[PDB]
Design a protein around this nucleic acid. Structure first.
Lengths: 143, 63, 141, 60, 145, 206, 80, 68, 139, 70
RNA sequence: UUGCUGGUUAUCCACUUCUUAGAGGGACUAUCGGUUUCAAGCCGAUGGAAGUUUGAGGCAAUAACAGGUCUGUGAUGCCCUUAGACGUUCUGGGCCGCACGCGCGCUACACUGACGGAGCCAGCGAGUCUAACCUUGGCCGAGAGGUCUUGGUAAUCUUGUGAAACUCCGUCGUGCUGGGGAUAGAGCAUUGUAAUUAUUGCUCUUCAACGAGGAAUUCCUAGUAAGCGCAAGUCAUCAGCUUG
């Protein structure tokens, strides 16, 4: 067969890889987890406070698997939603940049992602290896 | 409760002041060959079947 | 070179190009199988080619569709037009004319614009209103 | 298409009518491999009132 | 998740920070009826005090409530950094406070007199009862008096 | 039933249904038929569909609206009260859960329940405001069956909208109890109430 | 040295609106009566093989109230 | 409304009045004859004049048409 | 691949069967974290065999102080949901024996988990800091 | 707050005894029996599918649908 | 076991379906039927990318309005002023001032929802020569933002503008509630010669009326109404506006 992460539904993969990153422990969580808001266009911190950084880290690892490279700013544009500006109409507001950069450095520290040429960060060989491996495992779990 | 069915055989035109009522000639489904003229409310065309809740009141024109 | 065709399908600004070649029967959308098309209500909207006509006739051909433009809904109509038109073009060029007629007859007998592009495009808006037809609210003092 | 949208009126009276002027600008480019004489010949010639020609060398 | 047996340790309306808190609502949003603490402050305080957020506020054994009060009114000691506070860099201490319940209105009134004694324009405008932040007052604010 | 295995594996339930019989989300379309004469040709079961979404041009001609499959036409009337204009995927979710609730309560194939609710809620007699000398006396008129289907769908979905608003029931459940209680028309529903109010006013003013 | 001005006599010089309009303006500044000057322009344009001419003069002319006179000949289109 | 103006009708009339052979009943060939023997400054007006010549052929070939 | 890792786990169980324990305690110190990484692999068969290998490999350790503890300890080395449970049970052990390289090497990953986790309570951070202080002053 | 929230002892027996006989059961129905808020209705819906009592027929959040087991 | 998914502004070859834009084609209500002074036409079906003038515009007659503009003009007559100026410039204020009435709007009154993760999809644009514009990427910061470089005078780079509603999984559970975010306080930044009469952005706190709106009244017939954001105009900064 041969299973890519493209052969798995997105939330299934992100739950599997985020639970794996949870369990295994090679974390480097920033420390201002559970004080931080993940955007300025938000209202509350993430409801899955014991966690949620592995969720974003897993989604970022899937997101660099599917592209040539992404920097910090494209992740800030991606993960930032609409901001209720009070009584004024809504607007797109980018997310928190320190969150995404420490996601990228926390993944880069565990060998998943490497700083590529032409700017940005790429998926590396030991990232593709592990992501395709757990994609095959996620499709295996539903046998 | 006497229900009745009647087939639209000839739409005669539009009446009512604002124009939403339709003058329709209808021939009865059960016990046919007896045709009457009714005023229908919505969009009607021929070969429909109206439901006539009371069968004997032949309407002519609305103002 | 395998006997291969390329087609496309459109909706409002979404276009989807399909490459249909000879193969073992894989249907892919952007790299991913057709069972991963989500908004996930309109999944059975994109299955409609693959089973208006039998799930065979896709046994021996490989379809790869790439979508661009539009949004999450109009892309699904683009890709089902792409799969349908690609299958009838592959049957036109390589199988025969009669089987191409049978596929086109089945699709046209269903026809959620399966073979023909939806001709609707957005109207240009005008001054004095927020839309094409609408106007601003006036006051009459 | 360069579009400039302006009101029709110099004052502010009247129903608000708008006017979209536009200037179309078309570009082309031809890559040739020409000897420097034939470069000079084709670069000086083909002048026209209203066409702008810009000739560069060194495709690196 | 899972159902729990939960004998009668649950209590309704409970008194802390000199006010009442509805025990029938979740703790993070039940603490916001105290003045001076909102949704974000109560979320972070109930994280720093090691409280399960899936608890109703009446569950809440008194060690957790004592931790909540202690962190709530000593917040720089418990690493609620500086910018999460509503009385930073005060005007007399230069330390950062967090004005809680029957104090916060007091500090607002204190703030107002500190303008109004000094006769700065914001104070004169507060004492007339007009709009202060430079709003247009021709068309809006017509039933507030 | 002879499933086929091809290189992107299509699941056996998808082949199970969709190849042989072109049934719904999953509910049949051989049986149910309309139990009323005309209101045939204006309720459009058979042609069957797979999902209740279709970008169908049924608006540019006077009676092409009747060719819309009755589930999609009820789906289209769900997306209103302003904030929900557009949003047809929400509407397909509401219809999907409404049909499945209707299969739970009164087992009874839900497209029969929906079609019988349309036939039992469209007013057979209505009233029109003719002039008659200024203080406009109201005259009673009959109705066309397209108007009966129109008004039945509006009465059902406005009853579900008013019923699901500001109470713990979701709108699939208020659509479910509205469609059930209108199906074997129990006159506790909003639609049977409004229909018989319209007929008693037209009965008073004939 | 990088910009070259060239005169050119325009040809069939009655069929230009600018030449006839500044001609008419000079004939009026010198003080011709208005009907005479406009008919001179319109007849000299129709002599030059036009398809039509319109000369519209707005303003106050010896009265306090402003009027306009449209002296025309031939056929002119207006739309498209 | 598909009422055709006097431009289309008078040019169609004049095309039949001097070219009645050459001017068959098919639209796609009268479309080329109005390209050859007439000078029409647009494609749309050419198709309209060609369609009306085909129409008047269709009602000439079942008896006369008053005027032509 | 996971089959090669199953083979390496089988030959690690072969070596743990073969060689003596006092010689095996250096490799205990070296080999706790890698078998932790294997018992935390996503593949469940590799996870079960990496758990069983770790269980036998700590079961060869001659410690009467931590003898009933072992089944929980590698369980704590399996999933860090048990790290809030593990420190409170690690407190209730009468440490009468000297804690050399493997007896501390089986312990300190649990303490590092209770330190680095955001899920751990201030009570558990306090308990873990007290444990690492008395464990540095215990040797 | 209107006698609808917390966990109380008799309601465990009332859920294990009276969620059987319910033809259609969901969040709103476990609320609507003059009883539980929707939060513990959701908790009890996951718990009654954990063993025994209800079959899910339809999954998706914001509309739970469950039926009596057989 | 052939295979599957990727990377590499040139490692080459071929192609032009998708994209672009030159030249052309195509629809004329074609064909058939009905109906009609059997004329102009109208109505239905088939074929078609297209069958409302195919959709939307641009241009748009005569005669007028004591319509608006002397505050667009070095368009301009007559009157007024012209050195203690009605010219020009500088400083500070005002055009924002608030018992009230009216008009265009924005945000809401919630569960067809709010919040939190996750999915992840456009189109029209516009951008730095005597200059500091659009800004990717890397580090710092909760954020707003800061700093070092890079690409672009632009189908090349910003930019696939990874837009928003939406979709999935959850927390909330009908409670002026976690709907709503007005008002007011404190703090940090950015633009600017200068921010107080708070320019604006961000963080914490404060948590108002509003439970679908009386008489009245506006806009709208299909990719239209409505929801939803994005770009441009203005712009050192500021959009709840307009143009698309």
């Amino acid at each position: 067969p041969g299973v890519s992460v493209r052969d798995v539904a997105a939330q299934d993969f992100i739950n599997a890889y985020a639970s794996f990153l949870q369990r295994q422990g090679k974390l480097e969580v920033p420390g201002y987890v559970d004080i931080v808001k993940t955007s300025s266009g938000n209202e509350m911190p993430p409801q899955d406070a014991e966690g949620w950084f592995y969720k974003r880290a897993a989604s970022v690892a899937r997101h660099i698997y599917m592209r040539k490279q992404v920097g910090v700013g494209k992740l800030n544009k991606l993960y930032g939603g609409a901001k209720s500006r009070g009584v004024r109409p809504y607007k797109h507001i980018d997310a928190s940049g320190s969150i995404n950069r420490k996601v990228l450095q926390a993944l880069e520290k565990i060998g998943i992602v490497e700083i590529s040429p032409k700017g940005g960060r790429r998926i590396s060989e030991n990232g593709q290896r592990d992501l395709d491996r757990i994609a095959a495992q996620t499709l295996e779990e539903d046998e | 409760t006497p229900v009745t069915l009647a087939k639209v055989i000839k739409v005669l035109g539009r009446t009512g002041s604002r124009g939403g009522v339709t003058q329709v000639r209808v021939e009865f489904l059960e016990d046919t060959s007896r045709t009457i003229v009714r005023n229908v409310k919505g969009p009607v065309r021929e070969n429909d079947i109206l439901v006539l809740m009371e069968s004997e009141r032949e309407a002519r024109r609305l103002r | 070179a395998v006997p291969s065709v390329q087609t496309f399908g459109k909706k409002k600004s979404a276009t989807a190009v399909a490459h249909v070649k000879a193969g073992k029967g894989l249907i892919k959308v952007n790299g991913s199988p057709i069972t991963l098309v989500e908004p996930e209500i309109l999944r059975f909207k994109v299955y409609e080619p693959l089973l208006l006509v039998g799930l065979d006739k896709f046994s021996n051909i490989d379809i790869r569709v790439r979508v661009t433009g539009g949004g999450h809904v109009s892309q699904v109509y683009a890709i089902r037009q792409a799969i349908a038109k690609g299958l009838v073009a592959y049957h036109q060029k390589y199988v025969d004319e009669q089987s191409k007629n049978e596929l086109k007859k089945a699709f046209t007998s269903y026809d959620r614009t399966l073979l023909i592009a939806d001709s609707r495009r957005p109207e240009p808006k005008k001054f004095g209103g927020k839309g094409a037809r609408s106007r601003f609210q006036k006051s009459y003092r | 298409v360069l579009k400039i949208s302006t009101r029709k009126t110099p004052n502010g009276e009247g129903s608000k009518t708008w006017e979209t002027y536009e200037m179309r600008i078309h570009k082309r480019y031809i890559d040739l491999e020409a000897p420097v004489q034939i470069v000079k010949r084709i670069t000086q010639i083909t002048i026209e009132p209203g066409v702008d020609v810009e000739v560069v060398v060194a495709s690196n | 998740s899972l159902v729990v047996q939960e004998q009668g340790s649950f209590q309704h309306i409970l008194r802390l920070l000199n006010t009442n808190v509805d025990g029938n609502i979740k703790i993070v949003y039940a603490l916001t009826t105290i003045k001076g603490v909102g949704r974000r402050y109560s979320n972070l305080v109930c994280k720093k005090a090691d409280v399960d957020l899936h608890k109703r506020a009446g569950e809440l054994t008194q060690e957790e409530l004592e931790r909540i009060v202690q962190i709530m009114q000593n917040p720089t000691h418990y690493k609620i950094p500086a910018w999460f506070l509503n009385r930073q860099n005060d005007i007399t201490d230069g330390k950062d406070y967090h004005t809680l319940a029957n104090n916060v209105e007091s500090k607002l009134r204190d703030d107002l007199e500190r303008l109004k004694k000094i006769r700065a324009h914001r104070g004169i405008r507060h004492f007339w009862g007009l709009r202060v932040r430079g709003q247009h007052t021709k068309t809006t604010g017509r039933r507030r008096a | 039933f002879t499933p086929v295995v091809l290189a992107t594996p299509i699941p056996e339930e998808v082949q199970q249904a969709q190849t042989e019989i072109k049934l719904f989300n999953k509910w049949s379309f051989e049986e149910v038929e309309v139990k009323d004469a005309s209101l045939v040709d204006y309720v459009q079961v058979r042609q069957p569909i797979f999902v209740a979404h279709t970008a169908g041009r049924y608006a540019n001609k006077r009676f092409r609206k009747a060719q819309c499959p009755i589930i999609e036409r009820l789906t289209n009337s769900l997306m209103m009260n302003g904030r929900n204009n557009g949003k047809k995927l929400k509407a397909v979710r509401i219809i999907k859960h409404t049909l499945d609730i209707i299969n739970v309560l009164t087992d009874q194939n839900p497209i029969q329940v929906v079609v019988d609710a349309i036939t039992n809620t469209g007013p057979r007699e209505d009233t029109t405001r003719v002039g008659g000398g200024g203080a406009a006396r109201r005259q009673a008129v009959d109705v066309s069956p397209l108007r009966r289907v129109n008004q039945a769908i509006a009465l059902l979905t406005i009853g579900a909208r008013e019923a699901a608003f500001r109470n713990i029931k979701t709108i699939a459940e208020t659509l479910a109890e509205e469609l059930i209680n209108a199906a074997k028309g129990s006159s506790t529903s909003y639609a049977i109430k409004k229909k018989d109010e319209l007929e008693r006013v037209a009965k008073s003013n004939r | 040295g990088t910009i070259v001005l060239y005169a050119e006599r325009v040809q069939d010089r009655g069929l230009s609106a600018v030449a006839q309009a500044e001609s008419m303006k000079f004939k009026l500044l010198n003080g011709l009566a208005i009907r005479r000057a406009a008919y001179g322009v319109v007849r000299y344009v129709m002599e030059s093989g036009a398809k039509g001419c319109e000369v519209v003069v707005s303003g106050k002319l010896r009265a306090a109230r402003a009027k306009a006179m449209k002296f025309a000949d031939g056929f002119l289109i207006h739309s498209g | 409304g598909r009422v055709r103006t006097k431009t289309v009708k008078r040019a169609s009339k004049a095309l039949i009045e001097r070219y009645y052979p050459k001017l068959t009943l098919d639209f796609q060939t009268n479309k080329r004859l109005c390209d050859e023997i007439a000078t029409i400054q647009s494609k749309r007006l050419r198709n309209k004049i060609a369609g009306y010549t085909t129409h008047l052929m269709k009602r000439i070939q079942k008896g006369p048409v008053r005027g032509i | 691949k996971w089959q090669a890792k199953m083979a390496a786990l089988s030959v690690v169980d072969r070596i743990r069967e073969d060689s003596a324990n006092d010689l095996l305690e250096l490799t205990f110190k070296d080999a706790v974290p890698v078998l932790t990484d294997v018992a935390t692999d996503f593949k469940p068969e590799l996870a079960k065999q990496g758990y069983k290998t770790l269980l036998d490999y700590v079961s060869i350790l001659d410690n009467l102080d931590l003898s009933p503890r072992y089944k929980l300890i590698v369980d704590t080395l399996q999933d860090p949901s048990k790290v809030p449970e593990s420190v409170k049970s690690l407190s209730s052990v009468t440490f009468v024996a000297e804690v050399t390289e493997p007896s501390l090497s089986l312990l300190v990953p649990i303490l590092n988990r209770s330190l680095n986790l955001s899920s751990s309570s201030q009570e558990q951070l306090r308990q873990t800091v007290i444990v690492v202080e008395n464990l540095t002053r215990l040797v | 707050a209107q006698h609808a929230v917390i966990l109380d002892q008799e309601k465990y027996d009332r859920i294990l005894k009276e969620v059987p006989t319910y033809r259609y059961v969901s969040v709103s129905v476990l609320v609507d029996r003059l009883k539980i808020g929707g939060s513990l209705a959701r908790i009890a819906l996951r718990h009654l599918e954990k063993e025994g009592i209800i079959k899910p027929i339809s999954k998706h959040s914001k509309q739970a649908i469950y039926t009596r087991a057989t």
